[PDB]
Amino acid sequence: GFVFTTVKENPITSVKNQNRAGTCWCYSSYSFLESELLRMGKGEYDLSEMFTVYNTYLDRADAAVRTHGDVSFSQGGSFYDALYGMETFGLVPEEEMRPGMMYADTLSNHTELSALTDAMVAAIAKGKLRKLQSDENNAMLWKKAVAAVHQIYLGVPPEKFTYKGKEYTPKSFFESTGLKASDYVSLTSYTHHPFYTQFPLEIQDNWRHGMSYNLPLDEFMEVFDNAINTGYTIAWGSDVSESGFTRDGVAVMPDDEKKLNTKPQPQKWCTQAERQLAYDNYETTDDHGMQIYGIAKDQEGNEYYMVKNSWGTNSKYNGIWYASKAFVRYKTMNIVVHKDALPKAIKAKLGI
Amino acid sequence: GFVFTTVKENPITSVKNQNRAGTCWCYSSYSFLESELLRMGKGEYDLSEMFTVYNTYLDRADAAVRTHGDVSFSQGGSFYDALYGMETFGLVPEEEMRPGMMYADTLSNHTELSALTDAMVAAIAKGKLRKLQSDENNAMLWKKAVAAVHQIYLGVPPEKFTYKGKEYTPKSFFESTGLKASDYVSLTSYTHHPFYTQFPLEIQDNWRHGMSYNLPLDEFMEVFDNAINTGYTIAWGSDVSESGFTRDGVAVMTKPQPQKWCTQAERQLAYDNYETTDDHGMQIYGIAKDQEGNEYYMVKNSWGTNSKYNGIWYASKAFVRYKTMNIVVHKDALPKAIKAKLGIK
Amino acid sequence: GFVFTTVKENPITSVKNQNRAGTCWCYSSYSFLESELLRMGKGEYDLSEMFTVYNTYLDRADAAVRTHGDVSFSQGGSFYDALYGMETFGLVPEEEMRPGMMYADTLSNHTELSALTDAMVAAIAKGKLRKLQSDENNAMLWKKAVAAVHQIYLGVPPEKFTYKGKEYTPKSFFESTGLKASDYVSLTSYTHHPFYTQFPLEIQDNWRHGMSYNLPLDEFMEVFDNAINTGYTIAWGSDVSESGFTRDGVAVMPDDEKVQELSGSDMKKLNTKPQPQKWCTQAERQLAYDNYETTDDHGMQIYGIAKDQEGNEYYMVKNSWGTNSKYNGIWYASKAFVRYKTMNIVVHKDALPKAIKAKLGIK
Amino acid sequence: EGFVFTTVKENPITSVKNQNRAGTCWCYSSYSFLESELLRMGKGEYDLSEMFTVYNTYLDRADAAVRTHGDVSFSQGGSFYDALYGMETFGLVPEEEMRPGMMYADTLSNHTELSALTDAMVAAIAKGKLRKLQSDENNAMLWKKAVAAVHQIYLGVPPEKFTYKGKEYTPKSFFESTGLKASDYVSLTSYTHHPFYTQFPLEIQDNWRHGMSYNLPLDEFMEVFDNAINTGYTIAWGSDVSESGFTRDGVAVMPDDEKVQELSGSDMAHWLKLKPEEKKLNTKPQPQKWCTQAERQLAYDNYETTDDHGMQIYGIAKDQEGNEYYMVKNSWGTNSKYNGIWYASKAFVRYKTMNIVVHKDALPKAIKAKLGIK
Amino acid sequence: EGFVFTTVKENPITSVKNQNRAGTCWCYSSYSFLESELLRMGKGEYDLSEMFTVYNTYLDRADAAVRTHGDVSFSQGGSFYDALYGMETFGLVPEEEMRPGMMYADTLSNHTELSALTDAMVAAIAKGKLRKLQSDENNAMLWKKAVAAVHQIYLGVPPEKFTYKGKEYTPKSFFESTGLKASDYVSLTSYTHHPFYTQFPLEIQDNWRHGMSYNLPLDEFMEVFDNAINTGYTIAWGSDVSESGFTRDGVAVMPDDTKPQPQKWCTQAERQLAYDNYETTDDHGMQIYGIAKDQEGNEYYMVKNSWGTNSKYNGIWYASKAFVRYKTMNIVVHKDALPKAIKAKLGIK
Ligand SMILES: *CC(=O)CNC(=O)CCCC[C@H]1SC[C@@H]2NC(=O)N[C@@H]21
Ligand SMILES: *CC(=O)CNC(=O)CCCC[C@H]1SC[C@@H]2NC(=O)N[C@@H]21
Ligand SMILES: *CC(=O)CNC(=O)CCCC[C@H]1SC[C@@H]2NC(=O)N[C@@H]21
Ligand SMILES: *CC(=O)CNC(=O)CCCC[C@H]1SC[C@@H]2NC(=O)N[C@@H]21
Ligand SMILES: *CC(=O)CNC(=O)CCCC[C@H]1SC[C@@H]2NC(=O)N[C@@H]21
Ligand SMILES: [K+]
Ligand SMILES: [K+]
Ligand SMILES: [K+]
Ligand SMILES: [K+]
Ligand SMILES: [K+]
Ligand SMILES: [K+]
Ligand SMILES: [K+]
Ligand SMILES: [K+]
Ligand SMILES: [K+]
């Protein structure tokens, strides 16, 4: 087994539990932004994923119907979904739309919701209907249907609510936090687009085509180490379907110089080409969005990152995993950080 | 019946025949680009659609695979594929890659090609393979195979060739035309996005997600008339499915009758409810009048010349107002006032 | 445990490794033809399976398309595919067409290749196309595509090559053998055809419909023991998906009844130690073939005879699964198991007993 | 302005039969041919039972599908070789002993429900998940009993003995009394994916028995048709009939579209948009395309010539303009312009024939020798 | 040891039977029940042929699938009502005149191949595109001949006449010699999507005959169990057993989330939700024939199953009264097993 010492942490909020839903993109976004609110000085916040999970789905439904089934309709999503939704739909406190409130529960189970809405969206998007029906205001009946089924399972979005004495709209509540989409940028590292460029990652949950900035794998890993040591958290989207990623709370990248996962061992540090290949050949897919809040060493001096997951606190380190550098550099798909976490030099190469 | 008289037309090249493939996007784009080369004094070109179709399908296959099948793999394309293609792949003359050359024909029939390539792309993009194979230089084998099958049915793309006594590459040939993708804007008119912004049209053949400037409908149609009256032609993407231009070479809303002039909401309705779909690409190159004063855009099609007007036909202004999905024009074809509200230099 | 003593074995070449492809039919065929070349005093050969696997698949694709999908398109095959191929396509040394060279590997993994080529062949053979395309010389476009894809994953087969100071074509390299397909006969033992006649085994991988001579099962086993005691090896096709065939190197047909006669009324060691064996009648063997218990013609090579502690007789088999097994790629198949589960064998004509040869009309 | 035919020479045939709603042409054409053969050999008029042979053939085809795990398709078709092998293996019985339709109050076959049931039964065995098929204490397969029982329910119980014109027979002894011999008959084809003057099994689905055909150059292959007819023999004729030239009105022609378009008035561009009724391509005598060995090969290779239909060629005729046709006895009843007879132009036969069976003595002597047929 | 049981009161059962590889629990449990009824009525021990009844019921179930164009599923299951209707309609035969496995050289059922063919045959008629099924000159349907002939090939020829303990019978006259009457048995259930003291057909796929059950409030429903056992009757017991764990130790018990543990005692509504939300399905048929207690005094119904005797209690096992109350779907008892007052509340004379 492993024993880990913390080298450096930055404040996070409590550990949340997405339970039975592919909502990691939203719980990790909010985990990341809550940490940002703490460091900006706004106090502790608990935002409602269910509210923008709800709204993102209706748009995605619309996108699947426009593209006649090309845009897959599924539970997942992106960091960009949250940043966009925040400026578009607003934000509400968790208290106004909690997981599981409609089926006598306290945590999400979205399996039946998906069974119904997947079939509905597919009956429109991939069926044989030649002319979809609308009302006298040209509003579509199938979107009423889809939105109504989502509210039956997720709750009805508040149009107005009271929070800590003052009443809000989701927009004005969003303005109360003082977050701006522009402050944060998405970064990645691949060779099938030129470096220091903008491209939308070619993954199904990026159906909105959110753009990402493209660094070489060594500058890319310098923003991670810089962001931590200057006091920032990172929204970390990565591939966690790996023999190295454990349910015992550790994500390593063992070598063949060696019980590869159970005890500390030499790490395999990847070139840029070995890494691009894994994304081209399906060994690296957009599995999971989490939050990395700092740095640590194990009992042999090997270096790891402190990640906060969205699976509750029933695990070896109460819902926290340790992700090794060799793992984070091989299998990261994108990270969203705030601009001020970039080094000056890295920021400079094509960056305001 | 209809009797038309031309009001104004700008030069076009000859009518081509796409035959049996859904390559209208490329054929119309090249009719539009060739007209542009005439406008700019560069003379008459016949560009190879097959060459651009070839390279576009390879990128579409890679998009299908990367998105695990979400990007459909089909014969279709957009005006942006041709514009992106020329800057990315270059151009070659017609005779360097002709339709039908590999199966003893002179016109396209891509049904077998699609049947084989559709099955290969899906076996990768929607199968169960978890580690796709690569050579010792990290080049993917499935890409080699999809390209190899495309070459067997469409031809080996030239790396160099001689054209009117001068040697080129596809890149240096394109450079010799002086065309710039930066000169062309895409325009559309819808209410599910704000006017005077850019969004990418939500249609399966825009898998590259090329942006269009969104204009209110009355100004959208001002661009049509202004482009034609000042010497430009128009790359024209529209739903022709229900139009009945198959019967007489005319599209209306068989005698001249008053056209229902659509509002912005009725036209947004048809797009939202699937009545306006299957974006077909052609070229608008003039304005004509029927014997009762009604107004039509003259359309160059890519279905050959065995039709009532020898491959051209007429689309009433109203029809074009209702069923257009996007157009591509030179920047200089936009009126000064409209151009300024979009930030276009 | 098991302890084995060799009674008589005949030289084989080294144990090869087919890895992740259903190409046992070709590796076993070549294990047998290389043992043949050794026994004709021609030296140790390593013929290229990939060259023959490549050409076999193009024929098999053509058979699928001509029959509109009835001939299944898959990775398997038969000994006849190899003897047909040696005389139709030629032969090349291993070095000219290696497993895995196209995808930075040293052993085969044909899963992605099959993924692609199964889908292409099915798009033609089971699709709705009414007029396949062809070029100015009437050569079919689909065939070219299929061939180009096989080349990308397996290799470009050589037109000419140099081997030990001499240069060859695959054809001329095969004439360099002295091997003649007419020298080898296929034998089986079933009762849905009369004995001493020829019929094509009704199995999917016999899509060329190679004939086999049908023997009574007792004379069928005589051929085994004579072939081998007289110096020959056997190309051995049988079903190995049985309780008795194990990954621990043993293939037994144990009589579960006479085992459970010793010390119990059981509710344990039926394959991990010498045991009594069921000796099948011609009828029980027919039943398992009729009822799907004997299937999946897996190909291997028999080269030796051995006994265990209690004198039971076993055939020594050379597998094509590598050398990380209990006996470094060698299995032991009891004579009872072979008699029950064999689908067909190929031997040289002169390995037959004289009366068996005369009864089958073999010159 | 249609077709008017005059017979040049035809040889005796029995009456036109009607296979109706079943894919049994192979056995109907085979028995049209064998009945002409018995007439030719002086044995008189027979009406052999197709249903008997269809019944036993499908049981063999079911077994083939099961042994090959569904590779051998199970469907209604068949081959000439099915019937020749059949007469020597199962025997023959007279029509009266197993009539079409008799089990479902009908006089003509409708095998749609029989196929619906037995295709589904055969596929449940051959392509399903069963790992050990069941057997009784004599090792007979239960699935074969079930498939036999359902075939008997829709087609009838085959006789083991019957009386015919005062004499009791079994199927085998009735076959023996006709004096037919399968070894008297040869199958011939003409393709180039195998060398000439060899035998190979045509690679088509209904040849699941892999019956062989002798391969001839196209011109020699056509000489056989003529020599057979002109010396008193008839021809079992396996052909593609899915062509615009093969019509419901008793004609099979192979027009040269270019030529007809040049005889006509309109140029190429107008003609492409002319009316099919105005083209008159299949309704009057027209110049024929006369294919090469290679064009014939390409159509087989490329799916334009498929194994569609078995019939009997028994004569040679001319139309009012002197063009030549083979006379074809079909098996679809007599409600058609020529009472169930088709006239197939020589061009059509040369281009779309898949294989033929004739008695060995129908072969021209020099061709017989090239084939090694003694 | 975990569970140690003491019998409080059990009623005579015949030997434990083995349905082996077929979903014929409905018929084996029906006959366990009816054989106990025969013992109770003083007629002695019988061994009735499930295969005879299974054969005739599938031919009816195939007809029901064909008439509803595939809505009635065709599968191996069935109901107690199938057996009660069957005995009045087809008769009964002794086990020896139609044994499991006899046609394929076994002694136990394996109906996998039989289903593979007959499922495919029934679907080809009921779900295909045939517009006019074929009939003979007497208007008997050929597809029914086909399906009948295939069932006989795998299950045997049903006897028309046979001799048993020295007397010759037909299936009907053997049934009459037992003295059993379908009218003597009532079907009971407990749900709230229909009113209490009414009859309705349970909405489960194996009740394609739409046999009616009387609906009782849960407490009165359990009172019938105890009354039947304590006055000497047994119970045809249909319930969900899927997630119960009886396989491991012979014991079905109610999870509060090996050893006797506290049992959640469900309400009518808790029991209703599980039938509405799919937690209670796969009605499995067995026989309850006694009452037992464990070492700590908790009470169980004794269950006779039909899977042979290679289990911890030799084919018998124990269900807590709480499990039985939560997971039972329907029961059949003789009318005289009902308390007088429940009898009156349902109008049963
Ligand atoms: C990025 C994500 O949210 C996916 N990561 C997760 O941890 C969620 C997956 C857990 C598996 C659950 S969700 C869907 C499925 N249905 C169910 O009842 N359990 C499964
Ligand atoms: C915008 C497009 O290209 C679709 N428009 C067309 O005009 C395509 C027309 C050719 C029709 C061909 S395509 C595939 C199909 N297969 C065939 O043999 N004819 C059809
Ligand atoms: C006669 C044969 O070759 C049958 N197969 C073997 O002997 C062992 C190799 C099969 C294992 C491979 S085949 C295709 C499949 N795909 C994969 O990755 N492993 C499997
Ligand atoms: C060689 C053949 O027998 C091909 N078929 C024919 O020549 C005539 C058959 C007409 C098509 C019938 S068969 C079965 C199907 N069911 C129906 O009602 N009509 C179809
Ligand atoms: C109410 C029932 O009969 C379901 N209960 C059972 O005990 C049936 C389970 C036996 C398992 C057999 S039956 C069908 C399936 N096919 C097979 O070969 N084993 C399975
Ligand atoms: K939260
Ligand atoms: K992975
Ligand atoms: K062109
Ligand atoms: K080798
Ligand atoms: K087996
Ligand atoms: K007849
Ligand atoms: K045809
Ligand atoms: K019984
Ligand atoms: K349950």
Q: Residue B224 maps to which CATH number?
A: 3.90.70.10
Closest to B76 measured CA to CA, from B198, B190, B201, B207: B207
User: Cα-Cα-Cα-Cα dihedral of B312, B315, B317, B322, to 10°?
Assistant: -130
Q: Which residues contact C224 (CB under 8 A, 6 or more apart)?
A: C234, C302, C315, C335, C338, C345
Q: Which residues of B touch A122 (CB under 8 A)?
A: none
Q: Taking chain E, what is the end-to-end CA distance rounded to the nearest angstrom?
A: 48
Rounded Cα distance between B160 and A286, Å, is 41
Rounded Cα distance between D118 and D147, Å, is 7
Optimal mutation site among C116, C124, C144, interface B, most CBs of chain B within 10 A: C116
Rounded Cα distance between B106 and D308, Å, is 32
Closest to B332 measured CA to CA, from B32, B36, B42, B28: B36
- Copy the structure tokens of residue A147: 């939105």
CB D344 within 8 A of CB D328: yes
Q: Is D359 annotated in the active site?
A: no
Closest to D92 measured CA to CA, from D186, D173, D168, D33: D173
CB C112 within 8 A of CB B129: yes
Q: Which residues contact A241 (CB under 8 A, 6 or more apart)?
A: A285, A287
- Domain with D192, as residue range(s), is 1-374
The one-letter amino acid at D136: D
Spell out the long-range contacts of B297-302 with Cβ–Cβ below 8 A and sequence spacing 24 or more.
B297/B224, B297/B228, B297/B234, B297/B236, B298/B6, B298/B9, B299/B236, B299/B251, B300/B12, B300/B15, B300/B28, B300/B31, B301/B15, B302/B15, B302/B16, B302/B17, B302/B18, B302/B23, B302/B24, B302/B27, B302/B28, B302/B31
* Nearest chain B residue to D302, by CA: B112
Closest to C239 measured CA to CA, from C344, C341, C338: C341
Q: Is C24 annotated in the active site?
A: yes
Rounded Cα distance between D1 and D362, Å, is 37
Q: Taking chain A, what is the end-to-end CA distance rounded to the nearest angstrom?
A: 45
The structure's method of determination equals: X-ray
Rounded Cα distance between B74 and B118, Å, is 7
Q: Which residues of D touch E113 (CB under 8 A)?
A: 125, 130, 133-134, 142-143
CB contact under 8 A, E149 and D153: yes
Which sign, positive or negative, has the C-alpha torsion E100, E102, E108, E111?
A: negative
Q: How far is CA C175 from CA C38, C92, E66, in A?
A: 16, 11, 66
Rounded Cα distance between D35 and D44, Å, is 9
Q: What are phi and psi of B217, to 5 degrees?
A: -65, -40
- Copy the structure tokens of residue D333: 């009843």
Rounded Cα distance between A264 and A4, Å, is 11
Rounded Cα distance between B292 and B294, Å, is 6
Distance of CA D89 to the CA centre of its chain: 20
In angstroms, what separates the C-alpha of D270 from chain C's closest C-alpha? Answer: 25
Rounded Cα distance between B120 and C152, Å, is 14
Q: What is the DSSP letter of A266?
A: -
CB A125 within 8 A of CB A69: yes
CB atoms within 10 A of CB B160: 12
Q: What are phi and psi of D83, to 5 degrees?
A: -80, -35
Q: Which residues pair with A64 in a beta bridge?
A: none
Closest to C115 measured CA to CA, from B131, B110, A203: B131
Q: What is the DSSP letter of E77?
A: -
Q: Which residues contact C358 (CB under 8 A, 6 or more apart)?
A: none
The partner residue sitting opposite D71, judged by closest CB among C70, C131, C290, is C70
Distance of CA D287 to the CA centre of its chain: 27
Resolution of this deposited model, Å: 2.4
D291 is in an annotated binding site: no
Which ligand sits closest to the CA of B30?
A: 8
Q: How many structural domains comprise chain A?
A: 1
Q: Say if ligand 3 is within 6 A of residue C23 CB.
A: yes
Q: Which residues of C touch B119 (CB under 8 A)?
A: 119-120, 122-123
Q: Say if ligand 5 is within 6 A of residue E78 CB.
A: no
Which sign, positive or negative, has the C-alpha torsion C104, C110, C116, C117?
A: positive
**Helices and strands, counts by H and E, chain E:** 11, 12
Closest to A315 measured CA to CA, from A217, A248, A252, A229: A248
Rounded Cα distance between E301 and E283, Å, is 17
Rounded Cα distance between A308 and A314, Å, is 13
Interior CA angle at B133 toward B127 and B134, to 5°? 145
Which sign, positive or negative, has the C-alpha torsion B219, B225, B228, B231?
A: negative
- Any chain D CB within 8 A of the CB of E157? no
Q: Is E284 annotated in the active site?
A: yes
CB D125 within 8 A of CB D141: no
- Any chain A CB within 8 A of the CB of B274? yes
Q: Report CA(E42)–ligand 13 centroid distance (Å).
A: 19
CB C236 within 8 A of CB C313: no
Show the DSSP H helices in chain D as ranges: 25-40, 50-67, 80-89, 112-126, 142-155, 171-178, 218-230, 257-263, 268-272, 276-279, 293-301, 346-352, 365-370
Rounded Cα distance between D255 and D251, Å, is 12
**Beta strands D162-164; D167-169: pairing state:** antiparallel
Taking the CA of residue A251 as centre, how many other CA atoms within 13 Å lie in the half-sphere pointing to its CB? Answer: 26
Q: Which residues contact E183 (CB under 8 A, 6 or more apart)?
A: none
CB contact under 8 A, E113 and D134: yes
CB A184 within 8 A of CB A337: yes
Rounded Cα distance between E228 and E220, Å, is 12
**Beta strands D324-329; D309-318: pairing state:** antiparallel
Rounded Cα distance between D95 and A33, Å, is 88
- Any chain B CB within 8 A of the CB of C141? yes
The one-letter amino acid at C359: K
Q: Which residues pair with D162 in a beta bridge?
A: D169
Q: Say if ligand 5 is within 6 A of residue E325 CB.
A: no
CB contact under 8 A, C119 and B115: no
* Nearest chain C residue to B145, by CA: C149
